[PDB]
């Protein structure tokens, strides 16, 4: 079947099947201009047994790019423009069409916390303030909600959307944690008013949780309180991400990070999604234990490594970083085929 993704118990129900899922991050899939490259990539993800793909739902600019380059929104103090042409949201339309064809579901965030592909900084350039006042900047929020409406209305009745996601890794450095609680409450309510078929999630990294060991990611320096956020009624499941190399922790500390977050989701009566993770050094050795911990911990509904790498019919490779797991590689065998085999 092909139905809307729902929650049954503290598990996800994907096309009528209730149970744990594995997926992957492919931010760059949304910006491919050759349709054939979307299809080859999705064919590989599908044949590997993954069910869910996370793709960027944004591409924000202040200056229009060179003619032919992709852009989804131009942010200006004198009138913003949402691009629904061929070099705009039509690229994301084909992504959703290809997900429908390949029996894949998509997680789509609407804005980046970070300045890659514009982010909150692109709104600050147009609307003033700074990265922490963005959440309550009326002009910036009015345009952000216009952009949310533009994306959600295209795909509200598609069965290929796993969930709408308020942003990629929202933070409010040094802020009261209530700033993101109130913003996330209001914006998730808005998304539910536009679409009653789909699940909604925050997209945060999971920072701020008091049941940990006191390392910086468990403190409240980034404006987020995990337990407070996952109790928001209009958020259906929790997300958390994991990067020991960026956070100054060791890799094995990641097991406790999964366990504490899973317990907080289950206490709020909802599944958790282990939505990003990576190790720069020895990824097969260091990430395999995390995949096993997630699969065997109550409260966890699925996991999505960062990130898929692939190559195209013309011989070009995809965008990549030090965490990329290239399709058909030895690390694809260790972290993709062996993991999918262990799930089922
Ligand atoms: C951001 O703007 C707010 C309001 O003016 C201010 O209180 C805060 O210090 C600013 N952040 C930085 C990093 O300057
Ligand atoms: C689309 O989904 C909305 C709920 O989000 C529902 O009200 C509407 O009837 C659906 N449209 C069609 C044509 O079925
Ligand atoms: C992947 O590896 C298999 C061999 O296991 C091969 O048949 C197939 O062509 C490869 N896919 C690509 C895209 O190279
Ligand atoms: C790393 O971190 C934990 C504490 O965070 C410590 O108990 C453990 O021994 C360390 N593991 C390695 C392999 O460094």
Swiss-Prot record:
Binding sites annotated in the UniProt record for substrate: 169-171, 205, 247
Q: What is its EC number?
A: 3.2.1.78
Provide the alphabetized UniProt keywords. Disulfide bond, Glycoprotein, Glycosidase, Hydrolase, Secreted, Signal
Major subcellular location class: secreted
The protein's site described by Important for transglycosylation activity is found at: 171
**One example GO MF annotation:** cellulose binding
Listed under catalytic activity are: Random hydrolysis of (1->4)-beta-D-mannosidic linkages in mannans, galactomannans and glucomannans
Glycan attachment positions: 130, 157, 250, 328
Listed disulfide bonds for this chain? 26-29, 172-175, 265-272, 284-334
Q: Which residues form a coiled coil?
A: none
- Relate the activity to temperature as described in the entry: Optimum temperature is 75 degrees Celsius.
Annotated Gene Ontology cellular components are: extracellular region
| Catalytic site positions | 169 (proton donor/acceptor), 276 (nucleophile)
Segments spanning the bilayer are: none
What are the GO BP annotations of this UniProt entry? mannan catabolic process
Q: Where is this region: Catalytic?
A: 1-344
Functional pH dependence = Optimum pH is 5.0. Stable from pH 2.5 to 7.0.
Compartment(s): Secreted
Q: What does this protein do?
A: Endo-1,4-mannanase that catalyzes the random hydrolysis of (1->4)-beta-D-mannosidic linkages in mannans and heteromannans. It is a crucial enzyme for depolymerization of seed galactomannans and wood galactoglucomannans. Active against locust bean gum and ivory nut mannan, releasing mainly tri- and disaccharides. Also has transglycosylation activity. Transglycosylation of two mannotrioses into a mannohexaose is the major transglycosylation route.
Q: How is the quaternary structure described?
A: Monomer.
Q: Supply the domain comment.
A: The enzyme consists of two functional domains, a catalytic core joined to a carbohydrate-binding domain (CBM) by a serine-, threonine-, and proline-rich, highly glycosylated linker sequence. The CBM binds to cellulose but not to mannan, and increases the mannan-hydrolysis of complex substrates.
Query: Hey, which family's this protein in?
Result: Belongs to the glycosyl hydrolase 5 (cellulase A) family.
Q: What protein name applies here?
A: Mannan endo-1,4-beta-mannosidase A
- Write down the species: Hypocrea jecorina (strain ATCC 56765 / BCRC 32924 / NRRL 11460 / Rut C-30)
Q: Report where the shown chain sits in the full-length sequence: first residue, last residue, total length.
A: 28 to 371 of 437
